Amino acid sequence: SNTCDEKTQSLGVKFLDEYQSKVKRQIFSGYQSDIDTHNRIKDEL
Protein backbone atom coordinates (compact mmCIF):
# COMPACT_ATOMS: atom_id res chain seq x y z
CA SER A 1 0.00 0.00 0.00
CA ASN A 2 1.64 3.17 1.32
CA THR A 3 4.57 1.01 2.40
CA CYS A 4 5.28 -0.25 -1.13
CA ASP A 5 4.86 3.08 -2.94
CA GLU A 6 6.82 4.71 -0.15
CA LYS A 7 9.40 1.88 0.01
CA THR A 8 10.41 2.25 -3.68
CA GLN A 9 11.39 5.87 -2.95
CA SER A 10 13.22 5.01 0.24
CA LEU A 11 15.08 2.71 -2.11
CA GLY A 12 15.40 5.04 -5.20
CA VAL A 13 16.71 7.96 -3.09
CA LYS A 14 19.12 5.65 -1.31
CA PHE A 15 20.39 4.42 -4.67
CA LEU A 16 20.76 8.00 -6.05
CA ASP A 17 22.63 9.17 -2.90
CA GLU A 18 25.52 6.56 -3.03
CA TYR A 19 26.02 7.17 -6.76
CA GLN A 20 26.22 10.95 -6.11
CA SER A 21 29.04 10.00 -3.60
CA LYS A 22 31.14 8.18 -6.29
CA VAL A 23 30.66 11.26 -8.87
CA LYS A 24 31.46 13.92 -6.33
CA ARG A 25 34.30 11.87 -4.98
CA GLN A 26 35.88 11.49 -8.46
CA ILE A 27 35.13 15.09 -9.70
CA PHE A 28 35.84 16.52 -6.13
CA SER A 29 38.98 14.44 -5.28
CA GLY A 30 40.51 15.40 -8.70
CA TYR A 31 40.15 19.19 -8.42
CA GLN A 32 41.69 19.05 -4.90
CA SER A 33 44.28 16.67 -6.37
CA ASP A 34 47.40 18.52 -6.65
CA ILE A 35 45.87 21.64 -5.12
CA ASP A 36 45.82 19.69 -1.89
CA THR A 37 49.47 18.97 -2.66
CA HIS A 38 50.47 22.66 -2.61
CA ASN A 39 48.61 22.40 0.59
CA ARG A 40 51.20 20.02 2.20
CA ILE A 41 55.05 20.68 2.30
CA LYS A 42 54.90 24.28 1.13
CA ASP A 43 52.47 24.39 4.00
CA GLU A 44 54.57 22.69 6.72
CA LEU A 45 58.04 24.09 5.92
Binding site: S21, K24, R25, F28, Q32, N39, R40, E44
Partner: protein
Protein backbone atom coordinates in the same frame (compact mmCIF):
# COMPACT_ATOMS: atom_id res chain seq x y z
CA UNK B 1 55.52 -1.82 11.78
CA UNK B 2 51.80 -2.59 11.57
CA UNK B 3 50.46 -3.29 8.07
CA UNK B 4 47.08 -2.12 9.28
CA UNK B 5 45.72 0.56 11.60
CA UNK B 6 44.65 -2.00 14.21
CA UNK B 7 48.18 -3.22 14.74
CA UNK B 8 49.25 0.45 15.01
CA UNK B 9 46.58 1.51 17.47
CA UNK B 10 47.52 -0.90 20.31
CA UNK B 11 51.21 -0.02 20.16
CA UNK B 12 49.83 3.07 21.84
CA UNK B 13 48.18 2.75 25.23
CA UNK B 14 45.09 4.90 25.65
CA UNK B 15 43.87 4.39 22.07
CA UNK B 16 40.66 2.78 20.73
CA UNK B 17 39.36 1.46 17.39
CA UNK B 18 36.25 2.77 15.70
CA UNK B 19 34.71 1.09 12.65
CA UNK B 20 32.40 3.82 11.24
CA UNK B 21 32.42 2.50 7.74
CA UNK B 22 30.73 5.72 6.65
CA UNK B 23 31.15 9.26 5.40
CA UNK B 24 31.60 12.32 7.57
CA UNK B 25 28.35 14.12 8.19
CA UNK B 26 29.77 17.58 8.90
CA UNK B 27 33.16 19.26 9.30
CA UNK B 28 34.15 22.30 11.35
CA UNK B 29 37.48 24.09 11.24
CA UNK B 30 38.54 26.68 13.76
CA UNK B 31 41.10 29.46 13.70
CA UNK B 32 40.06 31.14 16.97
CA UNK B 33 43.03 31.34 19.32
CA UNK B 34 43.88 28.15 21.13
CA UNK B 35 40.85 26.60 19.41
CA UNK B 36 42.73 25.90 16.19
CA UNK B 37 41.67 22.32 15.56
CA UNK B 38 39.24 20.38 13.37
CA UNK B 39 35.97 18.78 14.34
CA UNK B 40 34.37 15.78 12.78
CA UNK B 41 30.97 14.23 13.22
CA UNK B 42 29.22 11.03 12.23
CA UNK B 43 25.54 10.39 11.42
CA UNK B 44 25.37 8.08 14.40
CA UNK B 45 26.66 10.68 16.84
CA UNK B 46 30.44 10.33 17.07
CA UNK B 47 32.40 13.61 17.20
CA UNK B 48 36.20 13.30 16.81
CA UNK B 49 38.95 15.91 17.06
CA UNK B 50 42.34 16.67 15.53
CA UNK B 51 43.96 18.24 18.65
CA UNK B 52 45.65 21.63 19.08
CA UNK B 53 49.30 20.91 18.40
CA UNK B 54 50.08 21.37 22.03
CA UNK B 55 52.70 19.61 24.14
CA UNK B 56 51.21 16.11 24.05
CA UNK B 57 53.10 16.08 20.74
CA UNK B 58 56.60 15.29 19.56
CA UNK B 59 57.94 17.58 16.83
CA UNK B 60 57.49 14.80 14.22
CA UNK B 61 53.71 15.00 14.66
CA UNK B 62 53.11 18.73 14.16
CA UNK B 63 53.21 18.37 10.37
CA UNK B 64 51.31 15.08 10.32
CA UNK B 65 48.38 16.85 12.04
CA UNK B 66 48.20 19.38 9.18
CA UNK B 67 48.10 16.53 6.69
CA UNK B 68 45.38 14.96 8.85
CA UNK B 69 43.04 18.03 8.93
CA UNK B 70 43.60 18.13 5.14
CA UNK B 71 42.56 14.44 4.75
CA UNK B 72 39.36 15.08 6.69
CA UNK B 73 37.79 17.77 4.47
CA UNK B 74 39.28 16.18 1.31
CA UNK B 75 37.37 13.12 2.48
CA UNK B 76 34.64 15.51 3.62
CA UNK B 77 34.08 17.21 0.28
CA UNK B 78 34.75 13.93 -1.50
CA UNK B 79 32.30 11.95 0.64
CA UNK B 80 34.58 8.97 0.98
CA UNK B 81 33.66 6.44 3.61
CA UNK B 82 35.85 6.31 6.72
CA UNK B 83 35.87 2.66 7.78
CA UNK B 84 38.05 2.91 10.83
CA UNK B 85 39.08 5.45 13.42
CA UNK B 86 42.10 5.12 15.64
CA UNK B 87 41.52 7.58 18.48
CA UNK B 88 42.82 8.51 21.95
CA UNK B 89 39.78 8.05 24.21
CA UNK B 90 41.32 9.84 27.18
CA UNK B 91 40.32 13.16 25.63
CA UNK B 92 36.90 14.71 24.92
CA UNK B 93 35.84 14.60 22.18
CA UNK B 94 37.82 11.52 21.06
CA UNK B 95 41.17 12.38 19.40
CA UNK B 96 42.14 11.04 15.95
CA UNK B 97 45.37 9.03 15.83
CA UNK B 98 44.79 7.42 12.42
CA UNK B 99 42.21 6.93 9.68
CA UNK B 100 41.42 4.01 7.39
CA UNK B 101 39.75 4.51 4.02
CA UNK B 102 39.30 1.26 2.00
CA UNK B 103 37.08 1.20 -1.11
Amino acid sequence: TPQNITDLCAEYHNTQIYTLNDKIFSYTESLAGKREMAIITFKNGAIFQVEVPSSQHIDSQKKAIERMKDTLRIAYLTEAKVEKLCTWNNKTPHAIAAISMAN
